[PDB]
Amino acid sequence: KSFDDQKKETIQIIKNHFQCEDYEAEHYLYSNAFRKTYDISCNKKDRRIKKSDFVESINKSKVLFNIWFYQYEGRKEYLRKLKESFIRRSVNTSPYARFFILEFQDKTDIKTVKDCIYKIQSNWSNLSKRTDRPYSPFLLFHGTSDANLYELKNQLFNEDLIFTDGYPFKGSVFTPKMLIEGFSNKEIHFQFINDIDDFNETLNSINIRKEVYQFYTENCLDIPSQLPQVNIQVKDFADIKEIV
């Protein structure tokens, strides 16, 4: 089969089997299957794998990064492909409790994390004074040291990106309701969930529809599965600015 024929039959086996749609088949199930075949072929230990084993290996709530889909179309075309597939947008954005879980590691510059936060803040918030339903995104960072984590929050405060984190004063216990009023507060730009234990407590205090967007490189946190999930792996943190 020619190159213009076998790719558009490669998805039809998964698509008819799972009865899925267009976007979660070519970009979510095909791309994981391509990556799940190289790491089992480059390995010189085992090659035989059951088809039922291969079904559950690629049907995880994760968009695996694919190296071969990075130079074939380019940096710009791959992030454009990931933009309109899982982060589809509308003209009117609903006041939803959107949670953004970004993997902060020690090799990442603080500045590159910062422009990701302003990109999330300017995209997923309507803090206008004439809003009767204001909303602002929730930010969660994991995998970094607290000294590097607290440094990021301090620089965000100096340049007037006011946030709340559930700790209104020093020595406070984690009150999750400060994140709740900050969601509807026009003067609070975003919420800053500190750790994963703070994240699950905030989910029980939200009664409106909530969504989770995870962007990671190596390690990915486990959100409970009843929520809407977007878990996308990227080459580096600078890709997250161009997809959200």
Residue numbers at the binding site for other proteins (CB under 8 A): 80, 83-84, 87, 89-94, 123-124, 126, 128-132
In the complex, the smallest distance separating the C-beta of residue 118 from other proteins, rounded to whole angstroms, is 12
In the complex, the smallest distance separating the C-beta of residue 124 from other proteins, rounded to whole angstroms, is 8
Q: Which CB atom, from 134 or from 182, has the smaller least distance to other proteins?
A: 134
Q: Which CB atom, from 52 or from 90, has the smaller least distance to other proteins?
A: 90
Q: Which CB atom, from 131 or from 145, has the smaller least distance to other proteins?
A: 131
**Sequence-separated (6 or more) residues with CB below 8 Å from residue 55:** 17
Neighbours of 204 (CB within 10 A): 8
Rounded to whole angstroms, the Cα distance separating 46 from 66 reads 21
Q: Which CB atom, from 42 or from 91, has the smaller least distance to other proteins?
A: 91
In the complex, the smallest distance separating the C-beta of residue 121 from other proteins, rounded to whole angstroms, is 12
Structure tokens at 44: 């010189």
Return the C-alpha torsion angle 18, 20, 22, 24, nearest 10: -90
CA angle, residues 241, 33, 88, in degrees to nearest 5: 35
Rounded to whole angstroms, the Cα distance separating 121 from 127 reads 10
Helix (H), strand (E) at residue 99: strand 97-103
Helix (H), strand (E) at residue 192: strand 190-193
| Residue 154 CA neighbour count, 13 Å, CB half | 6
In the complex, the smallest distance separating the C-beta of residue 134 from other proteins, rounded to whole angstroms, is 10
Q: Which CB atom, from 84 or from 236, has the smaller least distance to other proteins?
A: 84
In the complex, the smallest distance separating the C-beta of residue 168 from other proteins, rounded to whole angstroms, is 25
Q: Which CB atom, from 10 or from 93, has the smaller least distance to other proteins?
A: 93
Q: How many helices (H) and strands (E) does the chain have?
A: 11, 6
In the complex, the smallest distance separating the C-beta of residue 127 from other proteins, rounded to whole angstroms, is 10
Q: Which CB atom, from 41 or from 90, has the smaller least distance to other proteins?
A: 90
Q: In a 10 Å sphere around its CB, with 0-12 CB exposed, 13-18 middle and 19+ buried, how is residue 143 labelled?
A: middle
In the complex, the smallest distance separating the C-beta of residue 181 from other proteins, rounded to whole angstroms, is 18
